[PDB]
Amino acid sequence: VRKAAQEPKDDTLQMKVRQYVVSAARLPIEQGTKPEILQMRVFARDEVHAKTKFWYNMRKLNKIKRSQGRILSVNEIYEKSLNTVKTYGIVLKYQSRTAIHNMYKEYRDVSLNGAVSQLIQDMAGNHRAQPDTIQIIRTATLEPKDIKRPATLAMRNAALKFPIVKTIHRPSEKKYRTVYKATRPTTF
Amino acid sequence: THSYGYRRQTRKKFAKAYKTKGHVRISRYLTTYKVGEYVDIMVDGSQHKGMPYKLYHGRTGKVFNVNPRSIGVIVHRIVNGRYIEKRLHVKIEHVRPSNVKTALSKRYQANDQAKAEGNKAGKRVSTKRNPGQPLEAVQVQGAVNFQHPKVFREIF
Amino acid sequence: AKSKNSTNKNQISKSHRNGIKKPKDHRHISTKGVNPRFLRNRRRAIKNDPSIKKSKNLEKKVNKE
Amino acid sequence: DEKRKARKTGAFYVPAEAKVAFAIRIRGVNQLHPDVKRVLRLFRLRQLHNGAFFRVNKAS
RNA sequence: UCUCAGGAUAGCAAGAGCAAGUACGCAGUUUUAUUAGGUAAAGCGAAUGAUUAGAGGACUCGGGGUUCCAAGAAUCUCGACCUAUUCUCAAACUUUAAAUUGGUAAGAGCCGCGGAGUUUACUUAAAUGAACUCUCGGGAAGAAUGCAGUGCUCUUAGUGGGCCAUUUUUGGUAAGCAGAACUGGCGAUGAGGGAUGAACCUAACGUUGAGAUAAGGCGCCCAAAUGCACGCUCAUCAGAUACCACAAAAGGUGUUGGUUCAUACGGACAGCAGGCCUGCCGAAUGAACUAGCCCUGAAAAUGGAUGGCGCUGAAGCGUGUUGCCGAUACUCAACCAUCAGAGCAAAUGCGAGGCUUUGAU
Ligand SMILES: [Mg+2]
Ligand SMILES: [Mg+2]
Ligand SMILES: [Mg+2]
Ligand SMILES: [Mg+2]
Ligand SMILES: [Mg+2]
Ligand SMILES: [Mg+2]
Ligand SMILES: [Mg+2]
Ligand SMILES: [Mg+2]
Ligand SMILES: [Mg+2]
Ligand SMILES: [Mg+2]
Ligand SMILES: [Mg+2]
Ligand SMILES: [Mg+2]
Ligand SMILES: [Mg+2]
Ligand SMILES: [Mg+2]
Ligand SMILES: [Mg+2]
Ligand SMILES: [Mg+2]
Ligand SMILES: [Mg+2]
Ligand SMILES: [Mg+2]
Ligand SMILES: [Mg+2]
Numbered sequence: 001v002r003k004a005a006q007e008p009k010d011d012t013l014q015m016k017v018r019q020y021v022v023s024a025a026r027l028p029i030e031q032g033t034k035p036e037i038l039q040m041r042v043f044a045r046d047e048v049h050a051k052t053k054f055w056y057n058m059r060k061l062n063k064i065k066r067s068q069g070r071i072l073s074v075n076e077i078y079e080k081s082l083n084t085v086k087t088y089g090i091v092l093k094y095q096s097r098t099a100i101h102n103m104y105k106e107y108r109d110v111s112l113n114g115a116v117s118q119l120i121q122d123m124a125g126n127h128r129a130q131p132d133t134i135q136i137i138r139t140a141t142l143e144p145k146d147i148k149r150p151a152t153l154a155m156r157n158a159a160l161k162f163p164i165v166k167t168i169h170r171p172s173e174k175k176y177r178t179v180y181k182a183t184r185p186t187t188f
Numbered sequence: 189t190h191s192y193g194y195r196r197q198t199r200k201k202f203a204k205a206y207k208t209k210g211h212v213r214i215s216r217y218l219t220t221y222k223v224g225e226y227v228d229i230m231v232d233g234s235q236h237k238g239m240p241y242k243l244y245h246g247r248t249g250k251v252f253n254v255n256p257r258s259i260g261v262i263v264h265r266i267v268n269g270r271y272i273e274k275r276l277h278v279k280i281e282h283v284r285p286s287n288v289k290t291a292l293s294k295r296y297q298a299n300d301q302a303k304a305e306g307n308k309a310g311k312r313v314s315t316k317r318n319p320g321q322p323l324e325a326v327q328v329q330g331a332v333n334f335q336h337p338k339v340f341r342e343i344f
Numbered sequence: 345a346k347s348k349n350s351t352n353k354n355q356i357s358k359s360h361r362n363g364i365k366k367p368k369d370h371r372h373i374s375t376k377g378v379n380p381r382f383l384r385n386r387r388r389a390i391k392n393d394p395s396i397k398k399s400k401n402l403e404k405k406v407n408k409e
Numbered sequence: 410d411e412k413r414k415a416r417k418t419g420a421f422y423v424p425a426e427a428k429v430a431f432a433i434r435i436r437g438v439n440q441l442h443p444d445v446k447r448v449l450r451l452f453r454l455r456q457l458h459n460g461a462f463f464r465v466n467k468a469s
Numbered sequence: 470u471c472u473c474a475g476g477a478u479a480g481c482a483a484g485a486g487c488a489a490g491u492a493c494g495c496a497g498u499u500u501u502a503u504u505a506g507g508u509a510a511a512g513c514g515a516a517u518g519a520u521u522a523g524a525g526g527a528c529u530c531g532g533g534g535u536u537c538c539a540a541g542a543a544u545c546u547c548g549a550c551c552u553a554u555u556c557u558c559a560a561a562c563u564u565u566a567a568a569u570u571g572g573u574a575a576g577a578g579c580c581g582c583g584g585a586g587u588u589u590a591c592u593u594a595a596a597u598g599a600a601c602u603c604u605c606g607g608g609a610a611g612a613a614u615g616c617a618g619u620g621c622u623c624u625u626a627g628u629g630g631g632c633c634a635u636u637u638u639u640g641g642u643a644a645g646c647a648g649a650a651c652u653g654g655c656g657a658u659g660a661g662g663g664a665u666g667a668a669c670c671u672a673a674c675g676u677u678g679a680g681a682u683a684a685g686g687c688g689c690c691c692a693a694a695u696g697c698a699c700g701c702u703c704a705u706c707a708g709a710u711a712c713c714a715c716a717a718a719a720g721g722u723g724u725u726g727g728u729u730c731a732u733a734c735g736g737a738c739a740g741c742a743g744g745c746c747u748g749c750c751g752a753a754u755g756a757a758c759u760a761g762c763c764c765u766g767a768a769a770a771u772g773g774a775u776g777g778c779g780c781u782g783a784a785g786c787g788u789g790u791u792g793c794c795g796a797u798a799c800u801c802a803a804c805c806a807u808c809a810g811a812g813c814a815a816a817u818g819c820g821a822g823g824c825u826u827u828g829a830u
Binding site for chain 4: 496500501654
């Protein structure tokens with residue numbers, strides 16, 4: 001249980017993804033040289049986890065292995081303003097029992113970390129995806145001209161109203177909990 | 189296995205290496221061997237006499253006797269959870285000198301030299317070799333190559 | 345009748361149980377596999393070498409020669 | 410501070426790598442390859458919930 | 470071993486001992502140094518063996534059909550020979566060639582074509598060589614890590630039908646079949662979890678209290694969340710998960726995602742219209758795919774088994790997040806016993822197969 005600072009006060013409401021930048025270099029490590037540095041953006045729940053994500057992708061993308069290189073640094077990135085709602089696009093590859101797939105997904109959230117967490121839960125529930133399998137190709141905070149999904153564009157209007165049609169009874173604290181009460185609740 | 193005979197299952201071990209057919213290899217004829225040297229033992233298929241049992245091919249023995257056509261060597265075989273000394277006699281053909289001591293002597297002499305000189309200056313020199321060690325702190329100024337995970341594509 | 349023909353299962357462990365015994369390195373080794381030529385030489389060169397202490401009556405024999 | 414000078418350059422500074430590690434035994438005794446057993450024994454974790462220090466070596 | 474339900478024989482096991490427990494020693498471990506190997510793979514425009522496709526060819530090796538006229542020449546058809554290729558393969562093929570793994574080593578019993586010796590069918594033309602002795606010169610101890618398992622004697626019990634799991638494997642359509650390899654395990658073994666149950670998961674057991682756990686759980690039977698957040702699902706045959714108690718080829722205008730091509734106020738799709746086009750209507754509308762849950766494919770004999778109740782704002786499927794419950798393991802103490810520490814004479818508050826203590830088990 002280690003929180004990143006930009007996570008909510010209630011741990012419940014969001015997953016423990018954080019967004020990392022990791023960068024490393026070919027091991028020989030020649031001093032005065034101007035090294036090729038390999039840098040990548042990973043989403044993980046740890047520094048360790050991030051390192052893994054890093055290396056996996058890196059050994060797939062290029063010749064390098066870990067005994068062949070060194071980790072220069074791992075730096076968590078944060079979201080600018082948690083005051084506004086943004087529409088995020090994400091581009092994925094994941095692995096389904098048959099084959100591998102490229103998906104584009106959109107979520108309306110306050111954080112790119114939130115965008116990701118929601119992405120994972122969704123991908124589990126609807127697609128039975130395994131986290132380890134998921135590869136996020138590219139992520140963009142979306143400009144309105146660019147938002148393509150109906151359940152996304154669905155929420156743009158000021159005239160938005162939800163009645164709350166059914167209120168399921170939920171006592172305020174536990175101190176108030178009773179199995180059986182002397183009269184029936186209401187919905188509304 | 190239904191058959192047990194001195195050469196059983198000797199097929200590819202003893203076949204001469206590619207394009208080795210009929211190589212006489214005069215060098216082995218000339219190699220000098222001494223009672224205490226370490227020999228590596230390697231069979232050649234053209235020379236049938238003084239052939240060791242396949243088990244001993246590629247083993248490292250210690251020389252023990254020297255005969256006119258053959259070097260007596262010493263190897264050990266694990267048998268029923270114990271080691272058993274075996275005195276081999278190899279014809280010159282199937283024997284070659286092992287570098288396992290050569291390395292040692294070369295190293296030692298150089299090292300000893302270093303230590304003697306240091307003893308001259310009051311500096312104790314140590315010859316102990318340390319294995320790979322955790323990397324020292326570093327500064328890095330370089331060009332950043334930013335990679336992104338590729339989309340999947342099928343090549344048919 | 346039916347039996348299990350050859351299994352090497354428990355035998356490896358059994359062998360490692362008390363350790364693998366290795367013989368003792370003895371300064372002086374037996375003479376097996378050493379030719380008689382060399383051996384006679386050793387015998388002679390030892391008998392005649394004064395820097396090698398013999399028995400008393402032996403030295404008598406050696407000093408007479 | 411090294412980190413700071415780095416960050417400002419756009420360059421980065423890698424601290425020297427840990428020379429001391431700690432290990433704790435997660436798993437029980439039963440049913441283990443004899444090699445594994447002995448490796449554990451060398452690391453001096455002979456039971457569950459045993460921590461120890463070790464150097465960091467190609468060896469270790 | 471006339472040996473196959475048995476015997477010996479090694480191995481495994483116990484007790485009594487020996488030795489300076491060469492720690493510069495030891496090791497089912499790495500590291501470093503020197504080295505082996507022909508398996509996996511791959512390779513057959515490379516050898517051996519198979520083996521498809523088309524074309525060319527000055528020069529070719531023969532057959533046949535064609536034609537002409539005539540026996541020749543011209544020419545269609547075959548293959549064989551190259552020419553440049555090409556399809557698919559080998560446990561009894563192989564150039565190439567791994568991972569895992571095998572030898573031997575990592576110094577005082579070391580290193581150095583420096584010395585002086587000893588050798589009567591040892592070596593050489595050769596004080597040449599060789600092997601051993603006494604010398605001369607140099608040599609911080611020559612990797613990590615661990616050592617509550619030092620080496621060896623002596624005497625001897627039981628055993629000699631095995632069985633299972635992961636991975637690898639051969640015969641077999643197959644089998645809770647028959648055989649093999651490495652490591653375990655079960656037998657010889659309990660405790661908690663898989664409702665249940667030899668070989669699965671945690672975990673290895675002296676008597677006892679506390680705490681925090683593993684495996685697994687927390688709607689009730691049941692300790693602990695009818696917790697807090699996500700996605701998906703309505704079954705007139707839902708579903709409910711390792712080893713585990715089975716389902717396939719094949720299908721669905723059920724529902725939700727995603728992929729690739731398309732339409733639309735220079736008014737689409739559809740319907741109604743009307744003569745390919747055109748009006749009305751009015752913002753979204755096509756097509757092929759893919760994978761989730763759901764539906765069909767899905768027949769058996771006593772009455773029935775996600776373990777049972779029952780569960781659909783889940784008590785279902787794939788996740789997120791926090792706490793809590795929970796072994797005979799882990800902590801901490803008390804007691805018992807085992808093994809090992811330390812201390813007990815001019816003695817003495819008591820018994821030396823003793824007393825006092827300490828750590829592990
Ligand atoms: Mg070979
Ligand atoms: Mg043994
Ligand atoms: Mg009987
Ligand atoms: Mg016996
Ligand atoms: Mg004893
Ligand atoms: Mg030591
Ligand atoms: Mg090994
Ligand atoms: Mg090799
Ligand atoms: Mg595996
Ligand atoms: Mg069987
Ligand atoms: Mg295994
Ligand atoms: Mg195992
Ligand atoms: Mg029995
Ligand atoms: Mg058990
Ligand atoms: Mg308790
Ligand atoms: Mg609820
Ligand atoms: Mg039922
Ligand atoms: Mg059912
Ligand atoms: Mg159940």
